Curated annotation (Swiss-Prot):
Lysozymes have primarily a bacteriolytic function; those in tissues and body fluids are associated with the monocyte-macrophage system and enhance the activity of immunoagents. Has bacteriolytic activity against M.luteus. Belongs to the glycosyl hydrolase 22 family. One of its GO terms (molecular function) is beta-N-acetylglucosaminidase activity. Its EC number is 3.2.1.17. Keywords: Allergen, Antimicrobial, Bacteriolytic enzyme, Disulfide bond, Glycosidase, Hydrolase, Secreted, Signal. It catalyses: Hydrolysis of (1->4)-beta-linkages between N-acetylmuramic acid and N-acetyl-D-glucosamine residues in a peptidoglycan and between N-acetyl-D-glucosamine residues in chitodextrins. GO terms for biological process: cell wall macromolecule catabolic process; defense response to bacterium; defense response to Gram-negative bacterium; defense response to Gram-positive bacterium; killing of cells of another organism. One of its GO terms (cellular component) is endoplasmic reticulum. Substrate binds at D101. This is Lysozyme C. Its main location: secreted.
Length: 129
């Protein structure tokens, strides 16, 4: 599923991401835009052979099991395919664990490089929340 911007903002707010660990909702929408273009089915392979999955491009090296990342962990205790569902619950719950692990949203390279230090509130402007 390809979310609209405000549709995704509302879904993320309902799932508790607004100000989660101090990150306002626009940060999460911005990160999703540049990680996946709001597409829950996005996948991208990394050089080390891991794969990033879903709307927030969660990496199989640490966070989910895809059966093909030898020596990886599955810290969210989910198959990576669960992160491609049109229901973002699995992605959000796993993202909460990632952002809580000490590096905040710097875990998402696109957030660091394209959202951090910008007017991220612009990403939820005009939405009914
Ligand atoms: Cl915001
Ligand atoms: Cl980037």
């Amino acid at each position: 599923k390809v979310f609209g911007r405000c549709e995704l903002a509302a879904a993320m707010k309902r799932h508790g991401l607004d100000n989660y660990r101090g990150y306002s909702l626009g940060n999460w929408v911005c990160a999703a835009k540049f990680e996946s273009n709001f597409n829950t089915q996005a996948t991208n392979r990394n050089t080390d052979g891991s794969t990033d999955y879903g709307i927030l491009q969660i990496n199989s090296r640490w966070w989910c099991n895809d059966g093909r990342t030898p020596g990886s962990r599955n810290l969210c205790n989910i198959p990576c395919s669960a992160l491609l569902s049109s229901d973002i619950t699995a992605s959000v719950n796993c993202a909460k664990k990632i952002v809580s692990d000490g590096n905040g949203m710097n875990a998402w390279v696109a957030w660091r490089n394209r959202c951090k230090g910008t007017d991220v509130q612009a990403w939820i402007r005009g939405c009914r929340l």
